[PDB]
Write an enzyme that holds these catalytic residues in place. Structure first.
Site, PDB file in Angstrom:
ATOM      1  N   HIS A 106       0.776  -1.236   0.000  1.00 27.60           N
ATOM      2  CA  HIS A 106       0.000   0.000   0.000  1.00 27.60           C
ATOM      3  C   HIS A 106       0.817   1.301   0.000  1.00 27.60           C
ATOM      4  O   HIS A 106       0.303   2.376   0.339  1.00 27.60           O
ATOM      5  CB  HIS A 106      -0.980  -0.026   1.168  1.00 27.60           C
ATOM      6  CG  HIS A 106      -1.711  -1.323   1.293  1.00 27.60           C
ATOM      7  ND1 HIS A 106      -1.355  -2.280   2.212  1.00 27.60           N
ATOM      8  CD2 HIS A 106      -2.739  -1.845   0.582  1.00 27.60           C
ATOM      9  CE1 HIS A 106      -2.133  -3.337   2.066  1.00 27.60           C
ATOM     10  NE2 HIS A 106      -2.980  -3.100   1.082  1.00 27.60           N
TER      11      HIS A 106
HETATM   12  S1  FES Z   1       1.674  -0.465   3.013  1.00 31.08           S
HETATM   13 FE1  FES Z   1       0.046  -1.797   3.652  1.00 31.08          FE
HETATM   14  S2  FES Z   1       1.042  -3.609   4.410  1.00 31.08           S
HETATM   15 FE2  FES Z   1       2.639  -2.157   4.036  1.00 31.08          FE
END
Ligand code: FES
Ligand SMILES: CCCCCCCCCCCCCCCCCC(=O)OC[C@H](COP(=O)([O-])OCC(O)COP(=O)([O-])OC[C@@H](COC(=O)CCCCCCCCCCCCCCCCC)OC(=O)CCCCCCCCCCCCCCCCC)OC(=O)CCCCCCCCCCCCCCCCC
Ligand SMILES: CCCCCCCCCCCCCCCCCC(=O)OC[C@H](COP(=O)([O-])OCC(O)COP(=O)([O-])OC[C@@H](COC(=O)CCCCCCCCCCCCCCCCC)OC(=O)CCCCCCCCCCCCCCCCC)OC(=O)CCCCCCCCCCCCCCCCC
Ligand SMILES: CCCCCCCC/C=C\CCCCCCCC(=O)OC[C@H](COP(=O)(O)OCCN)OC(=O)CCCCCCC/C=C\CCCCCCCC
Ligand SMILES: CCCCCCCC/C=C\CCCCCCCC(=O)OC[C@H](COP(=O)(O)OCCN)OC(=O)CCCCCCC/C=C\CCCCCCCC
Ligand code: HEC
Ligand code: HEM
Ligand code: HEM
Ligand SMILES: CC(/C=C/[C@@]1(C)[C@H](C)CCC(=O)[C@@H]1C)=C\Cc1c(O)c(Cl)c(C)c(C=O)c1O
Ligand SMILES: CC(/C=C/[C@@]1(C)[C@H](C)CCC(=O)[C@@H]1C)=C\Cc1c(O)c(Cl)c(C)c(C=O)c1O
Ligand SMILES: CCCCCCCCO[C@@H]1O[C@H](CO)[C@@H](O)[C@H](O)[C@H]1O
Lengths: 61, 49, 380, 70, 241, 81, 49, 48, 49, 54
Positions: free
Chosen positions: I14
């Site tokens: 993410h």
């Molecule tokens: S950015 Fe979501 S698990 Fe690392």
């Protein structure tokens, strides 16, 4: 007269009835548990590790 | 009775008794030259040095 | 419109219209409590079952040890395993009384409710069987071998039918995985059909001990029978738990504590107690196909009962001769079970063939005969 | 410290072998052994008798052996 | 031909529905297994951690497991390598595979003792009688070489020479290691091994009876209570005239 | 669906009943209950029991007779040498 | 092996008796034990298959 | 897998016999080498 | 390792950015990478755990 | 109108239509719709850089 005192205060209102069952179940548990465990352990003196325990538990070395 | 039977069944899902709680891990700081990152298998998930 | 939200709602109108406002005869005896117990078992089996499925591993090289691990490591796994295995037995005990009741009280005159019942029985049997194979112990294996081998008696398509069953050319891993699949699935099909069983029922209503219309006297299922069933539950539950908690293995064969050996068939190989009576019959007919047919018929004969009813009355309450015959039949099965638990040697072999011959006669010839006779004694 | 390690099992096997049943069984066994031993072409064996004895002996033994153990 | 002697019924301290296992006798049982049976008998489903809180202290258990060499790996060069045992290890198998186990017992296969008391009719009563029951074959019975006579074993010819004899070991708790004293102990162990729950399973059974008792009663009243309406009921047929 | 109101045609039957709170749950345990428990037991024990008691014998017999056939008959080795 | 009333074999499942030849003599079994395809190509070394 | 796709049955078999395959255990629970069979998988060049 | 706009770390799931210290600098991540309990009992050999 | 034969036939047809690209896809281009990362046995230590869901 408890029966009347109880009925009038606890058992009549279907909402207080529930509070009694919960509040009661809680007390009933805590006590029924000790009692039984107490009956069981007694029936098995010196056989449980709870008993043997002291012989090696920080007793040697 | 009910609360107790749920208590049990629900913890049948928790971690078992065979799941450990292990030690450490030694690593030579001479395998990891300056300016680098390395990954070591450890306690399940990765470990960076 | 509909005032209460109990009679209009497309759903609650169901919980209410099939278990709360349901018209029940006021005089149904304890022999009618098995319906619910059977029902309750199903839900209990299914539940404990899933819990186990979450730790089992359908693979020859891992089945036995997974179950072993499930018990020694999984928190309360040991208890769940017990409950599941002993539920299987109390399930059968209950189903057998459920059936007897039907037989003794001519509930089989409710043909569809009955026929779906028989279907249920066969399904429960198939289920309990394959469950018993999952732990992959000695019985597990040899059971799997003998039962799938039964199709071999069917000419032509026989020897092939066995190939699928196994997935190979001798019991092995494929058999174990398609068995776990099968076990996982059937219970639901059971739950499904149970719904139909109960639906056909509802068309007519329950029967009652005297076997005469109870329209002149019906009562709301709740609270009469809901309370009566809660009680009937706490009663079955006591010995079920007394058994499972104090003497776990009382009811079960020990061969299943020995990982399957494809080369050694244990000398004392018996099936789980609830199948003995059939195992007994199978070992009667000293011919491959005959024994198989006799076995099949030993259960499938239930489909014929409705048609072999000659009495002008519905139940045996007022038929003292049928009663004796009925109880003579029970003791008759009780014997086959003993026989099924003994070796294939004299005097057993002879006692065996007898009880079997006895079983099929009391059902196809006697009952319908004494029945007719009784009609004449009433002057009908 | 001054004692001696005796196996309570052997002691109790002695006392029990004096039991009504053991004696009457030990007797039938001694008899068989004698005839099978002497005969040099008999299929007979004294298993059955041996068991009767042992069954009786050992049964008796189990009734007290555990009182003396720890 | 099909003759057999059945073992008697000893009064085990853990025989009662409410009787727990004598954890003192199990600690010894373990010793017996550890120093005598574990030489030919595997116990694949038990592990050093299992002893903790049952018969041993955490210290003891850990040291008990470090007394063994355990194969691990692979390392960085994909090489297996020995190492000391951890409480999470399972009891050591004395042979790599059955083939070799037979190879050093005259083709006899000493079964894994994990679930033994439940895999043999008689349980500890059997195992016991068999350990202590070795003796001479009766008149007319010839025992094949390499085998031993035991009346308690089906066939009477067993492949295990009597494993225990007086003082064969020494209980570090000071209990006179007579022969039956041992057998009695090791059997008590083989039970704990085949089902560790045992004790808890019975404590529950207790709680179950009490609640079951109390509850069946309460509900029996409630059932009668409601039904009374119908039980006392009176009806009369008063047709008009 | 609904079956309360269709069931059957009934006329001239009066029924009187009392609330549960006005009466006893398990009344006349002695004068009425037990007497009938006995009443019932009696009438039925002779239709039920017989065949069971019967199978029992057949069980005890076949059992003991299978045991007897295990024991040896001296008349086999009383000629051996 | 070595059981049954024909000094051959005995199937504990449903009571079939085979003789020292592997032939079916008593019980529900339909045919005699199958005899594979073998050969003696040694002094004391046989080969089945 | 090579049979009928890229090779004849003869070829495939000999192709597999060109390899040494570990099997066992034997009678003394000892591993032991052996020539490959058409049922063997392609050899791994490293144990792990 | 070695990516992100902080010359530290980057979570491809993410988009979280960690620096060479393992601290959370950008993205949805809530806290800084966890720092284990170790000890440098050597000259070029460390022990984590 | 009575579901059958109006909508039963209309649905049989609506079936043979969805079925055509479903099969044209599954038979001619199997992996078109699917991520290829799942051809690599899980690695508890490495999160693929191009990790996207179904
Ligand atoms: S950015 Fe979501 S698990 Fe690392
Ligand atoms: C408690 C059991 C009731 C005791 C009794 O026999 O009542 C006699 C008597 C009542 O007399 P009654 O009203 O004439 O009896 C009519 C009914 O039988 C009175 O009984 P009931 O109608 O009120 O209760 C019916 C109950 C009765 O329970 C039993 O029959 C037992 O049966 C059930 O509820 C069915 C459950 C069966 C579960 C078994 C599980 C199968 C596992 C098998 C292994 O009660 C007493 O004497 C008082 C005892 C306190
Ligand atoms: C064959 C398709 C019909 C061709 C057309 O556009 O009809 C025009 C025309 C009929 O004219 P129309 O009566 O005024 O059209 C009204 C309806 O649209 C006439 O069409 P319809 O009502 O008789 O047929 C309806 C049909 C029409 O099918 C389509 O729209 C295509 O749609 C379905 O049955 C639904 C199935 C959808 C399956 C798609 C699966 C999803 C996977 C996506 C990747 O047919 C022709 O010109 C003759 C062609 C031979
Ligand atoms: C932490 C401690 C544990 C806490 C437990 C969680 C608390 C749960 C909430 C309890 C709230 C109870 C509310 C119920 C009140 C409804 C009601 O009207 O009363 C009960 C009502 C009867 O009404 P009356 O007595 O005629 O009159 C009413 C007085 N004005 O309904 C009944 O019939 C109750 C019968 C209760 C017993 C039935 C269940 C027994 C079943 C046996 C098996 C049990 C164990 C297995 C369960 C495991 C499930 C996975
Ligand atoms: C198949 C393998 C199953 C293994 C065997 C399990 C058998 C267990 C032992 C027998 C259990 C039965 C208990 C005896 C109960 C005695 C009793 O109450 O009998 C009298 C009583 C009173 O009769 P009424 O005329 O209706 O009274 C009203 C007017 N006063 O009779 C009854 O309860 C009715 C009969 C109940 C059925 C119970 C039969 C037991 C179950 C057997 C299964 C039989 C069916 C065949 C299955 C094929 C598969
Ligand atoms: C020399 C290896 C060895 C030792 C040491 C030994 N056993 Fe065994 N044991 C065997 C053999 C071999 C068998 C297999 C006998 C057979 O099947 O012919 C066996 C079998 C058994 C069996 C019963 C097998 C059956 O089929 O009923 C039990 C129970 C058993 N041993 C317990 C023990 C106990 C308890 C001890 C430790 C006090 C012990 N053994 C020590 C070799 C040994
Ligand atoms: C999954 C298995 C089964 C379940 C859960 C089940 C469930 C039910 C239930 C709840 C009832 C209503 C209450 C009662 O009268 O007992 C019932 C009735 C009945 N069942 Fe079953 N049943 C099962 C198996 C069978 C079997 C095997 C048969 C047939 C051999 C059968 C025959 C009947 C009949 C005839 C009725 C009507 C009873 C009457 O006359 O009142 N059932 N069943
Ligand atoms: C019809 C209800 C059911 C019956 C009659 C039943 C019966 C059985 C039987 C007889 C066994 C062998 C028990 C033993 O002796 O070890 C068993 C085991 C098992 N069953 Fe079921 N079962 C049922 C439903 C389920 C379902 C639906 C699941 C899971 C969703 C399940 C999963 C299993 C598993 C994993 C085992 C094997 C391991 C073990 O024995 O503990 N069962 N079942
Ligand atoms: C499965 C069941 C009842 C189940 C429970 C689950 C209730 C829904 C709530 C309270 C309980 O615990 C019962 C055991 C009843 C089955 C059932 C029926 O379907 C029908 Cl048609 C009848 C006539 C009866 C008569 O006794 C019956 O018992
Ligand atoms: C009782 C029975 C078969 C029952 C079935 C096959 C019914 C005839 C139809 C529905 C089923 O699914 C049952 C499992 C076969 C006898 C039977 C067994 O059950 C089992 Cl476990 C074994 C190990 C043997 C060994 O010889 C056996 O003969
Ligand atoms: C209907 C009968 C219900 C019986 C309920 C008994 C609940 C079991 O109680 C259990 O007792 C064990 C030992 O005391 C504890 O370790 C468990 O956590 C506890 O759930």
């Amino acid at each position: 007269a408890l029966l009347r005192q109880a009925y009038s205060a606890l058992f009549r209102r279907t909402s207080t009835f529930a509070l009694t069952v919960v509040l009661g179940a809680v007390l009933f548990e805590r006590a029924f548990d000790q009692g039984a465990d107490a009956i069981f352990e007694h029936l098995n003196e010196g056989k449980l590790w709870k008993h043997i325990k002291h012989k090696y538990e920080a007793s040697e070395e | 009775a009910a609360k107790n039977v749920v208590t049990q069944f629900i913890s049948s899902l928790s971690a078992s008794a065979d799941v450990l709680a292990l030690s450490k891990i030694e690593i030579k700081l001479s395998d990891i030259p300056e300016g680098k990152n390395v990954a070591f298998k450890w306690r399940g998930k990765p470990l960076f040095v | 419109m509909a005032p209460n939200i109990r009679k209009s709602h497309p759903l609650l109108k169901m919980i209410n219209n099939s278990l709360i406002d349901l018209p029940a005869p006021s005089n149904i005896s304890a022999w009618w409590n098995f319906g619910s117990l059977l029902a309750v078992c199903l839900m209990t089996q299914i539940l404990t079952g899933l819990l186990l499925a979450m730790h089992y591993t359908a693979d020859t090289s891992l089945a036995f040890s997974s179950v072993a691990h499930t018990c020694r490591n999984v928190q309360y796994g040991w208890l769940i395993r017990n409950l599941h295995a002993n539920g299987a037995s109390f399930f059968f005990i209950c189903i057998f009384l459920h059936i007897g009741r039907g037989l003794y009280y001519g509930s089989y005159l409710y043909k569809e409710t009955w026929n779906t019942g028989v279907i249920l029985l066969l399904t429960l049997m198939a289920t309990a069987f394959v469950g018993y194979v999952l732990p992959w112990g000695q019985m597990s294996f040899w059971g799997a071998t003998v039962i799938t081998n039964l199709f071999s008696a069917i000419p032509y398509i026989g020897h092939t039918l066995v190939e699928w069953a196994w997935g190979g050319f001798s019991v092995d891993n494929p058999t174990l995985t398609r068995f776990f699949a099968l076990h996982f699935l059937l219970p639901f099909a059971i739950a499904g059909i149970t719904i139909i069983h109960l639906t056909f029922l509802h068309e007519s209503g329950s029967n009652n001990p005297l076997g005469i219309s109870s329209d002149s006297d019906k009562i709301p299922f709740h609270p009469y029978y809901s309370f009566k069933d809660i009680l009937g539950l706490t009663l079955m539950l006591t010995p079920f738990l007394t058994l499972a908690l104090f003497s776990p293995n009382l009811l079960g064969d020990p061969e299943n504590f020995t990982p399957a050996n494809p080369l050694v068939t244990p000398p004392h190989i018996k099936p789980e107690w609830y199948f003995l009576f059939a195992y007994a019959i199978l070992r009667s007919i000293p011919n491959k196909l005959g024994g198989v047919l006799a076995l099949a018929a030993s259960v499938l004969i239930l489909f014929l009962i409705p048609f072999l009813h000659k009495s002008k009355q519905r139940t045996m309450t007022f038929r003292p001769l049928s009663q004796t015959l009925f109880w003579l039949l029970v003791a008759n099965l009780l014997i086959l079970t003993w026989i099924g638990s003994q070796p294939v040697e004299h005097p057993f072999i002879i006692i065996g063939q007898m009880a079997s011959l006895s079983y099929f006669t009391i059902l196809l010839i006697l009952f319908p005969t004494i029945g007719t006779l009784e009609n004449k004694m009433l002057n009908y | 410290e001054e004692e001696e390690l005796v196996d309570p099992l052997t002691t109790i096997r002695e006392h029990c072998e004096q039991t009504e049943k053991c004696v009457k069984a030990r007797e039938r066994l001694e008899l068989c052994d004698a005839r099978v031993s002497s005969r040099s072409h008999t299929e007979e064996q004294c298993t059955e008798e041996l068991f009767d004895f042992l069954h009786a002996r050992d049964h008796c033994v189990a009734h007290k052996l555990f009182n003396k153990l720890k | 031909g099909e003759l057999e002697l059945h073992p008697p019924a000893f009064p085990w301290s853990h025989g009662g529905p409410l009787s727990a296992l004598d954890h003192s006798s199990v600690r010894r049982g373990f010793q017996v297994y550890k120093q005598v049976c574990s030489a030919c008998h595997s116990m694949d489903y038990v592990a050093f951690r299992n002893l903790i809180g049952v018969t041993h202290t955490e210290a003891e258990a850990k040291a008990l497991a470090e007394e063994v060499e355990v194969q691990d790996g692979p390392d960085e060069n994909g090489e297996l390598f020995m190492r000391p045992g951890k409480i999470s290890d399972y009891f050591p198998k004395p042979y790599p595979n059955p083939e070799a186990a037979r190879a050093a017992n005259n083709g006899a296969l000493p079964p894994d003792l994990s679930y033994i008391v439940n895999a043999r009719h008689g349980g500890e009563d059997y195992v016991f009688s068999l350990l202590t029951g070795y003796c001479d074959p009766p008149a007319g019975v010839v025992v094949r070489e390499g085998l031993h006579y035991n009346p308690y074993f089906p066939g009477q010819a067993i492949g295990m020479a009597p494993p225990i004899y007086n003082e064969i070991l020494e209980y570090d708790d000071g209990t006179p290691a007579t022969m039956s004293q041992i057998a009695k102990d090791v059997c008590t162990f083989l039970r704990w091994a085949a089902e560790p729950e045992h004790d808890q399973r019975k404590r529950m059974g207790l709680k179950m009876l009490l609640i079951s008792a109390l509850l069946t009663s309460l509900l029996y009243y409630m059932k009668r209570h409601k039904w009374s309406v119908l039980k006392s009921r009176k009806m009369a047929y008063r047709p008009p005239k | 669906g609904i079956h309360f109101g269709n069931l059957a045609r009934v006329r001239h039957i009066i029924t009187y009943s009392l609330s549960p709170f006005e009466q006893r749950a398990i009344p006349n345990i002695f004068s009425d209950a037990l007497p009938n428990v006995w009443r019932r037991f009696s009438s039925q024990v002779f239709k039920v029991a017989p065949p069971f008691l019967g199978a029992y014998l057949l069980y005890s017999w076949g059992t003991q007779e299978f045991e007897r056939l295990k024991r040896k008959n001296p008349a086999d080795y009383e000629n051996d040498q | 092996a070595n059981s049954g009333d024909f000094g051959g074999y005995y199937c504990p499942c449903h009571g079939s008796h085979y003789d020292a030849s592997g032939r079916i003599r008593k019980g529900p079994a339909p045919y005699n034990l199958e005899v594979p395809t073998y050969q003696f190509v040694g002094d004391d070394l046989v080969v089945v298959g």
